[PDB]
Amino acid sequence: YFQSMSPGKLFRQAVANEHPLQIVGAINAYCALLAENVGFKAIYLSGGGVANTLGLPDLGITDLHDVLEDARRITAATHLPLLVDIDTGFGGAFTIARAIKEMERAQVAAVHMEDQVAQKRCGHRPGKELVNTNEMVDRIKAAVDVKSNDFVLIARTDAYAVEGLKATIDRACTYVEAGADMIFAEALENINDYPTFCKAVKVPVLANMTEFGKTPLYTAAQLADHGVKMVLYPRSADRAMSKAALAVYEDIKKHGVQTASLPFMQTREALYEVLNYHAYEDKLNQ
Amino acid sequence: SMSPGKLFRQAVANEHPLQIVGAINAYCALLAENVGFKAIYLSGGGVANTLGLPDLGITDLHDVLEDARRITAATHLPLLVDIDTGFGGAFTIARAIKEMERAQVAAVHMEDQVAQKRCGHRPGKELVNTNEMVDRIKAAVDVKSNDFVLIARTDAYAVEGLKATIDRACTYVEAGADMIFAEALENINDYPTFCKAVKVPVLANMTEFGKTPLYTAAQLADHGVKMVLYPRSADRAMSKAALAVYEDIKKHGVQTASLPFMQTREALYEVLNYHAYEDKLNQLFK
Amino acid sequence: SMSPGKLFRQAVANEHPLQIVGAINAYCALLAENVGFKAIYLSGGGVANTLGLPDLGITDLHDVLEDARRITAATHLPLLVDIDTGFGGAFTIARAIKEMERAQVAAVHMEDQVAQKRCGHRPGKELVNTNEMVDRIKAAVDVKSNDFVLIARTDAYAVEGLKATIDRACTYVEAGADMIFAEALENINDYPTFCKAVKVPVLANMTEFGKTPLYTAAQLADHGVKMVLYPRSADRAMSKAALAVYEDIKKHGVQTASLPFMQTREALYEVLNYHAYEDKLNQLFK
Amino acid sequence: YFQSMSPGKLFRQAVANEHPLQIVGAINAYCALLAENVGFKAIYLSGGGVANTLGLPDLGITDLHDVLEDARRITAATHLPLLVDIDTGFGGAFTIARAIKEMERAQVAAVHMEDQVAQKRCGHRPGKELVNTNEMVDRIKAAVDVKSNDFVLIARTDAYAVEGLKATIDRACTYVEAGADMIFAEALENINDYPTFCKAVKVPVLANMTEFGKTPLYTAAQLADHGVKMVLYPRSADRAMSKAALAVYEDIKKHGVQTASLPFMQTREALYEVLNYHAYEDKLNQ
Ligand SMILES: C[C@](O)(C(=O)O)[C@H](CC(=O)O)C(=O)O
Ligand SMILES: C[C@](O)(C(=O)O)[C@H](CC(=O)O)C(=O)O
Ligand SMILES: C[C@](O)(C(=O)O)[C@H](CC(=O)O)C(=O)O
Ligand SMILES: C[C@](O)(C(=O)O)[C@H](CC(=O)O)C(=O)O
Ligand SMILES: [Cl-]
Ligand SMILES: [Cl-]
Ligand SMILES: [Cl-]
Ligand SMILES: [Cl-]
Ligand SMILES: [Cl-]
Ligand SMILES: [Cl-]
Ligand SMILES: [Cl-]
Ligand SMILES: [Cl-]
Ligand SMILES: [Cl-]
Ligand SMILES: [Cl-]
Ligand SMILES: [Cl-]
Ligand SMILES: [Cl-]
Ligand SMILES: [Cl-]
Ligand SMILES: [Cl-]
Ligand SMILES: [Cl-]
Ligand SMILES: [Cl-]
Ligand SMILES: [Mg+2]
Ligand SMILES: [Mg+2]
Ligand SMILES: [Mg+2]
Ligand SMILES: [Mg+2]
Numbered sequence A, D: 001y002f003q004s005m006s007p008g009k010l011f012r013q014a015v016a017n018e019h020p021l022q023i024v025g026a027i028n029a030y031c032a033l034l035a036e037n038v039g040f041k042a043i044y045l046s047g048g049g050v051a052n053t054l055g056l057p058d059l060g061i062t063d064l065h066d067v068l069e070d071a072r073r074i075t076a077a078t079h080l081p082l083l084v085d086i087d088t089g090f091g092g093a094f095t096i097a098r099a100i101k102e103m104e105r106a107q108v109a110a111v112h113m114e115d116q117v118a119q120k121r122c123g124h125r126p127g128k129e130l131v132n133t134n135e136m137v138d139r140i141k142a143a144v145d146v147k148s149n150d151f152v153l154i155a156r157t158d159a160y161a162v163e164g165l166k167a168t169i170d171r172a173c174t175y176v177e178a179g180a181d182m183i184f185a186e187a188l189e190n191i192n193d194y195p196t197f198c199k200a201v202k203v204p205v206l207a208n209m210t211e212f213g214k215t216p217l218y219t220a221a222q223l224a225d226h227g228v229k230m231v232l233y234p235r236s237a238d239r240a241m242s243k244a245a246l247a248v249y250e251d252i253k254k255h256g257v258q259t260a261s262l263p264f265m266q267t268r269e270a271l272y273e274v275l276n277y278h279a280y281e282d283k284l285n286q
Numbered sequence B, C: 001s002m003s004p005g006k007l008f009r010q011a012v013a014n015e016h017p018l019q020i021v022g023a024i025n026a027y028c029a030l031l032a033e034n035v036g037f038k039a040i041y042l043s044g045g046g047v048a049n050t051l052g053l054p055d056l057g058i059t060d061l062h063d064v065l066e067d068a069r070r071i072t073a074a075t076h077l078p079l080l081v082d083i084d085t086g087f088g089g090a091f092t093i094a095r096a097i098k099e100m101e102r103a104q105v106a107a108v109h110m111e112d113q114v115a116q117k118r119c120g121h122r123p124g125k126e127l128v129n130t131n132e133m134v135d136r137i138k139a140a141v142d143v144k145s146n147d148f149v150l151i152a153r154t155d156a157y158a159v160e161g162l163k164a165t166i167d168r169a170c171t172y173v174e175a176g177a178d179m180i181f182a183e184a185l186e187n188i189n190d191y192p193t194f195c196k197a198v199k200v201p202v203l204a205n206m207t208e209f210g211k212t213p214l215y216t217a218a219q220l221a222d223h224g225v226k227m228v229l230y231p232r233s234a235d236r237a238m239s240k241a242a243l244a245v246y247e248d249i250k251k252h253g254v255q256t257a258s259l260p261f262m263q264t265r266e267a268l269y270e271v272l273n274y275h276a277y278e279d280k281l282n283q284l285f286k
Helices: A007-017 A029-038 A047-053 A064-077 A093-105 A133-144 A165-177 A191-201 A220-225 A236-255 A259-264 A268-275 B004-014 B026-035 B044-050 B061-072 B090-102 B130-141 B162-174 B188-198 B217-222 B233-252 B256-261 B265-272 B275-284 C004-014 C026-035 C044-050 C061-072 C090-102 C130-141 C162-174 C188-198 C217-222 C233-252 C256-261 C265-272 C275-284 D007-017 D029-038 D047-053 D064-077 D093-105 D133-144 D165-177 D191-201 D220-225 D236-255 D259-264 D268-275
Strands: A021-025 A042-045 A082-085 A110-114 A152-157 A182-186 A205-208 A230-233 B018-022 B039-042 B079-082 B107-111 B149-154 B179-182 B202-205 B227-230 C018-022 C039-042 C079-082 C107-111 C149-154 C179-182 C202-205 C227-230 D021-025 D042-045 D082-085 D110-114 D152-157 D182-186 D205-208 D230-233
Touching: A007 A021, A007 A042, A007 A110, A007 A152, A021 A236, A021 B233, A029 A042, A029 A064, A029 A236, A029 A268, A029 B044, A029 B233, A042 A047, A042 A064, A042 A230, A047 A064, A047 A082, A047 A236, A047 B026, A064 A082, A064 A093, A064 C090, A064 D064, A093 A110, A093 A133, A093 C275, A110 A133, A110 A182, A133 A152, A133 A165, A133 C275, A152 A165, A165 A182, A165 A191, A191 A205, A191 A220, A220 A230, A236 A259, A236 B018, A236 B026, A236 B233, A236 B256, A236 B265, A259 B233, B004 B018, B004 B039, B004 B107, B004 B149, B018 B233, B026 B039, B026 B061, B026 B233, B026 B265, B039 B044, B039 B061, B044 B061, B044 B079, B044 B233, B061 B079, B061 B090, B061 C061, B090 B107, B090 B130, B090 D064, B107 B130, B107 B179, B130 B149, B130 B162, B149 B162, B162 B179, B162 B188, B179 B188, B188 B202, B188 B217, B233 B256, B275 D093, B275 D133, C004 C018, C004 C039, C004 C107, C004 C149, C018 C233, C018 D236, C026 C039, C026 C061, C026 C233, C026 C265, C026 D047, C026 D236, C039 C044, C039 C061, C044 C061, C044 C079, C044 C233, C044 D029, C061 C079, C061 C090, C090 C107, C090 C130, C107 C130, C107 C179, C130 C149, C130 C162, C149 C162, C162 C179, C162 C188, C179 C188, C188 C202, C188 C217, C233 C256, C233 D021, C233 D029, C233 D236, C233 D259, C256 D236, C265 D236, D007 D021, D007 D042, D007 D110, D007 D152, D021 D236, D029 D042, D029 D064, D029 D236, D029 D268, D042 D047, D042 D064, D042 D230, D047 D064, D047 D082, D047 D236, D064 D082, D064 D093, D093 D110, D093 D133, D110 D133, D110 D182, D133 D152, D133 D165, D152 D165, D165 D182, D165 D191, D191 D205, D191 D220, D220 D230, D236 D259
Parallel strands: A021 A042, A021 A230, A042 A082, A082 A110, A110 A152, A152 A182, A182 A205, A205 A230, B018 B039, B018 B227, B039 B079, B079 B107, B107 B149, B149 B179, B179 B202, B202 B227, C018 C039, C018 C227, C039 C079, C079 C107, C107 C149, C149 C179, C179 C202, C202 C227, D021 D042, D021 D230, D042 D082, D082 D110, D110 D152, D152 D182, D182 D205, D205 D230
Antiparallel strands: none
């Protein structure tokens, strides 16, 4: 409306307005513009996406700055509310506080922080270990301490795969008590566990619709009918982009020319429309 | 021991001709490397457009430098970087060259448009006079290392005709440019006379949706061309793929129909060389 | 609820006159805040010089933006930022304003020099015509929020005389500048006629080693000035102190003679508010 | 000589040439230019300095990017070899590897990494705890794995204050066996412990000459005569700069003008000489 809303308020309103809110991963500002064009009401900056786009595996190598810089580029280009993955907060209480404040300064609408172990030994192997409830509570309190009211903290639990449904609900509920605004859980293997989950935690729940993992793909409607308020598509666009890029590279290498690839390329014209190119080049000219 | 610039010069000498493919980010550069390209490119229009900006000279040294650094962190494959008109006067050009060298960049191209430049394939470009471009080149050559490659790009063809273009190119070589970028030549039969006149290696720009027909690398080489550039080819396909995934999710409430068009986790793991990470930990911490 | 720009406008209205002190970094801004200044300044010459560059328009939006962000992260004290001539054309100026707003900056000043600008106190400045500066201002006003302060700076005095300067300033106000920066006026008696003619608040630049005698804030206010700027004062003393410590260590093999000239750990801890950190941990994790 | 030496080689050579090498802290590029002018042969980027200059306490809040960005600005301005504080490496093996590679890419000559605990619990209080020898060995091996031969890794031990001389020597020796190039220890309370220390570890030893701690100030000559190859002055310049800045701020606030401060300010002329201003403004002019 005519209030000029804060990013967090826009996010909360998008969640309330949609049934459910679909949030799509965008690796850069241009992809966010594409999503906006299609009509999505919220967008997402994946941590794994930030790492992988740098040519790094998703092993917690990236820091606040890697993510912050990708987030800033996106929010500069669109007012569509952005949810940002900040992993485990990048360090202790003061680093978490810095992350929240910097994300808010970057006009980000929401972040999710998770309950994985962060600060393992130097030569410590990759794995799927959870911190205790109390430790995650501390992380949340560090975040809640400095956030504005409108800004959305989503607490993400990875407990489901490891601990089962009951333990997950207990954590999620404790996380809400600590001040989390919403809850991020993996796609439950059984759609009919959602009503119990959503009713227990009270706050809006996000379901993560990842491909090529251990989790099934339900429709947004199905998920909403079972109590879910947000559905996330974290890497979907990016996996298709990579296949397309690879195919173009192979085409050029094999054939000495990109002719066969032409039908698979967005046109200059469509690119110009997404950028509003003509309302620059033409619009203002000597 | 072998500098980026040296690797570039050697790639140019070894290949007939050297295909240089655009990569917008480090992951795309890894894809190109996997396919077996010998040099990669950071497009200025790509830098701008990926930020959601038109290619109108809004971006500065920092926008481009940051994208270049992310790519060279991930690969030793020699990178050619678009630095437009050098981002300002002599001192800015000098800063650009030194920063590009510090970022392990192999080559740059700088062009002879007036400051507020456009795509070389667009109508209504203004050129600086030969003397002014000479000054730009001199500023660059004054601070570059010997191995580092300065490519002088001329946009003169559309505006001044083939003869004037060749004269500029030749003057640019005399001023110390290492190679020539012959932008938006409309006919394969422009190349032999161009390439014979300038002597130094010449790049032909095989961009789509422009003023050039798409000739093969062999055809271009047979006409005296040493480098063929594919500046945005991968990027255009990526955008269409992203858009298609976004439409799928919006229309169908789920990304199932998109799955066949996505790179697999396995292929992603291979391109990131994920297993070398586990390997390294076993190597060092055992 | 109260925007940076609003805090700035209010500081200007409340003080007689508002003293604005240069701070090169966040720690200097904290020192100024401690002393009780109501507004702070990020000098363009300071941005350049601190990088080891001359103040010749080599720096870009990113150099300045990064220094501005570091300061505003540390303090809510309203910050005025030097954006030179806007770093390029209309679209660059628009980007600068939006980025400055995103960085929580309160005010900017933009001047009427030609692109490759110098210190306003140096001989041999070239000015753009009034019309061109008007265009610059319009580009800025078009995208700014209402609260955000655009200060139009004129360097015309040395080149064109007092009368021409006032005419420009007045045209700049008509174009939408909020306040006026009257650079390098040589005599206190230039101010009353200047300030009365332009109406909007006027800043006088009390820089050292320039073309201006150093008048008191009271004297300047009595002549109709609303803001007095001390752009590099702290920075010049810091450099002499650093140099003196370096000479001490080099000459004497030890820094003993320098100890009396060093801030104590205690004072440093107070300015950082170090104890609030321990306090916060006790508050939250008990 | 006429070889064009790598930064690390320049550092090694500076250490070998001097008796001992004095390395002075510089918070920014301009301070590094001042040190170079005075005649120092190596410079230092303090971690505490990076944090404090951001207005942050030295509590491990800063990351690789905060330090990297300050390091890049310095090395852009001078070829004087820079030693950079990278704390405990900013995370596990892969983060350490990234830190080394990025520091090398930034033309840094040397880093020091320490044996403090890093990855404490979220709401975990500030303190002076050491990791076990084995853990630091792992950190060193992570670093040595990716560094170039010439690049200098200095292993820093904080064991002295906590564990005594004997335990410190044992750690230092183990650190050298793991591949550290040099050793950083606090100022030993007894100058005559240095010969034993230096003879046991073999590699060059740095003594840290901090003010206002628990460590005494010996002269460079005294330290060198006892076996020490490097003496560090980490914050000295910066503490004097802060006192000078504060004094200028108080002057302007108290007196309404900076006249009393003038004798304590570096002149425009001296600033111009350090920057080589005249060989820009004059040197190249239309
Ligand atoms: C959402 C996620 O955490 C991410 O890093 O984007 C991933 C999603 C994915 O790529 O499978 C996750 O850890 O599930
Ligand atoms: C090569 C180019 O300079 C670019 O910035 O990618 C462009 C390509 C394009 O617009 O398709 C150009 O100006 O030719
Ligand atoms: C205020 C100023 O614009 C600056 O960039 O600090 C300078 C100050 C100076 O050079 O002393 C100016 O141009 O007046
Ligand atoms: C060298 C040091 O580690 C630093 O962070 O610069 C400090 C020095 C100091 O400021 O006392 C330290 O921890 O001793
Ligand atoms: Cl991965
Ligand atoms: Cl916007
Ligand atoms: Cl920001
Ligand atoms: Cl609840
Ligand atoms: Cl465009
Ligand atoms: Cl590499
Ligand atoms: Cl040549
Ligand atoms: Cl690896
Ligand atoms: Cl200067
Ligand atoms: Cl604050
Ligand atoms: Cl007005
Ligand atoms: Cl605090
Ligand atoms: Cl501290
Ligand atoms: Cl240099
Ligand atoms: Cl770099
Ligand atoms: Cl030994
Ligand atoms: Mg993630
Ligand atoms: Mg371009
Ligand atoms: Mg200035
Ligand atoms: Mg430190």
